[PDB]
Amino acid sequence: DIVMTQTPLSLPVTPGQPASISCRSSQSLVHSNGNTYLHWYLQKPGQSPQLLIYKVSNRFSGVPDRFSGSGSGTDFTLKISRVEAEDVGVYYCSQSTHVPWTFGQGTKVEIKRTVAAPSVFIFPPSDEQLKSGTASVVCLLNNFYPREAKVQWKVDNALQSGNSQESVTEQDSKDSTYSLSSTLTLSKADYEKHKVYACEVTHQGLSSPVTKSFNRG
Amino acid sequence: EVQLVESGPGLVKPSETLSLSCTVSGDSITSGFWNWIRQPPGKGLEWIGYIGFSGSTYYNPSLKSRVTISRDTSKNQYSLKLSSVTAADTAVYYCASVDNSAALDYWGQGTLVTVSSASTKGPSVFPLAPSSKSTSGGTAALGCLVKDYFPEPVTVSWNSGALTSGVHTFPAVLQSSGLYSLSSVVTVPSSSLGTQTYICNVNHKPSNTKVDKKVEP
Numbered sequence: 043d044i045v046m047t048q049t050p051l052s053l054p055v056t057p058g059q060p061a062s063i064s065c066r067s068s069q070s071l072v073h074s075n076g077n078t079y080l081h082w083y084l085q086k087p088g089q090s091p092q093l094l095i096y097k098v099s100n101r102f103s104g105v106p107d108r109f110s111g112s113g114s115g116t117d118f119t120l121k122i123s124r125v126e127a128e129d130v131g132v133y134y135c136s137q138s139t140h141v142p143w144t145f146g147q148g149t150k151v152e153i154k155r156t157v158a159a160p161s162v163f164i165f166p167p168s169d170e171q172l173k174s175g176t177a178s179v180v181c182l183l184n185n186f187y188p189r190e191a192k193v194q195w196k197v198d199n200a201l202q203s204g205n206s207q208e209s210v211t212e213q214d215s216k217d218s219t220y221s222l223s224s225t226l227t228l229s230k231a232d233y234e235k236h237k238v239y240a241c242e243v244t245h246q247g248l249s250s251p252v253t254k255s256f257n258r259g
Numbered sequence: 260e261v262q263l264v265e266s267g268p269g270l271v272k273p274s275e276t277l278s279l280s281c282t283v284s285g286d287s288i289t290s291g292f293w294n295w296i297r298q299p300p301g302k303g304l305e306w307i308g309y310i311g312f313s314g315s316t317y318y319n320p321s322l323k324s325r326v327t328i329s330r331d332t333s334k335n336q337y338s339l340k341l342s343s344v345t346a347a348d349t350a351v352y353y354c355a356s357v358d359n360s361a362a363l364d365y366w367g368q369g370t371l372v373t374v375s376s377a378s379t380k381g382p383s384v385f386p387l388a389p390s391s392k393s394t395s396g397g398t399a400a401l402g403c404l405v406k407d408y409f410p411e412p413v414t415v416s417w418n419s420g421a422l423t424s425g426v427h428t429f430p431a432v433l434q435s436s437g438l439y440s441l442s443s444v445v446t447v448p449s450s451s452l453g454t455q456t457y458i459c460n461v462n463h464k465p466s467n468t469k470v471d472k473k474v475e476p
Binding site for chain 1: 303304305306308317319320321353360361362363364366367368369383385386387388390392393395398400402404406427429430431432434440441442444446
């Protein structure tokens with residue numbers, strides 16, 4: 043297999059600033075017909091890859107002019123002259139010259155926008171779920187940046203551990219923020235035993251750690 | 260414009276039979292080359308093979324002779340079979356056309372296939388009700404907790420797709436039990452509660468689950 047290799051693997055960039063990605067192949071991609079079948083794809087958050095550039099330097103349909111590809115033989119580059127929030131996603135180089143066709147590892151472009159504090163919301167379990175013998179408490183951190191956020195659960199002021207999980211969205215292609223949901227799961231019996239439920243959030247954009255809580259009943 | 264749509268089961272047992280089919284619109288598959296590509300979880304892209312001009316095919320050697328691609332020209336469909344699957348074959352599978360530049364120009368939305376011996380299981384859907392614990396300034400948040408289903412994915416919309424602004428559907432988290440859980444939430448004006456009705460539309464195709472849950476304060 044022609045090994046295609048990409049650098050860097052993670053690419054943070056400030057909006058309006060240029061970005062470059064290097065792609066190497068293990069062998070020349072020059073076909074005997076004289077063409078070089080090197081292509082670039084972009085996979086935006088929550089969708090299929092799409093063709094960005096073909097045959098090294100040819101821009102595909104609707105691809106904004108800020109994107110350009112160059113290089114020859116085994117040494118290729120994708121340049122974005124000024125990055126926009128909508129350019130967020132994973133960029134892959136790929137070769138078509140030889141079978142099997144292969145892809146690079148992918149380069150994750152992250153947009154470095156202004157710091158934004160999360161809006162924090164807490165949700166007790168629904169009485170609908172309490173029937174089932176289980177209790178899920180949900181903490182929501184909405185529209186923040188950067189991604190680094192610390193959430194900790196306290197029940198009657200007792201630090202919790204091993205009974206919660208977090209999920210975080212991909213960076214939004216419009217406002218470049220993340221959101222995060224943390225769920226604390228107890229049995230109905232446990233949930234019924236304690237009074238104050240709280241999620242304490244720590245983040246760069248907060249003036250101090252923020253806690254949202256509620257009293258059972 | 261060419262459109263491609265993948266279909267088939269979302270769950271296969273180890274060692275059992277992966278079969279998917281791609282239905283093409285806006286072109287005839289009796290010309291050109293038609294492809295399968297896959298992407299394992301948070302993993303990058305792997306070209307599987309194509310079926311081309313006379314029913315001829317090429318398979319990536321990485322699949323070790325477990326793959327077969329075939330077509331039904333009368334229905335403008337082509338299909339993938341992958342034998343003796345293991346967890347390594349868990350992936351989103353895409354069909355895609357190739358053009359004259361030998362790039363992959365049009366892609367389907369892809370379909371997730373999970374290889375597991377666990378059983379199919381439909382989610383319970385619970386409200387995340389808006390309250391004073393989810394209202395700050397003029398903003399409120401509400402949502403749906405989609406709990407305890409297998410395998411992925413679940414789809415969530417709000418008000419049959421009328422409400423898209425402010426919606427975040429989080430990636431599913433795999434619970435220790437081996438079942439997935441996810442939340443979808445929306446931020447809305449506090450002034451809209453009681454005036455507007457919010458319903459989350461949940462779909463889990465692998466279990467035939469279709470649920471509409473009204474979320475109220």
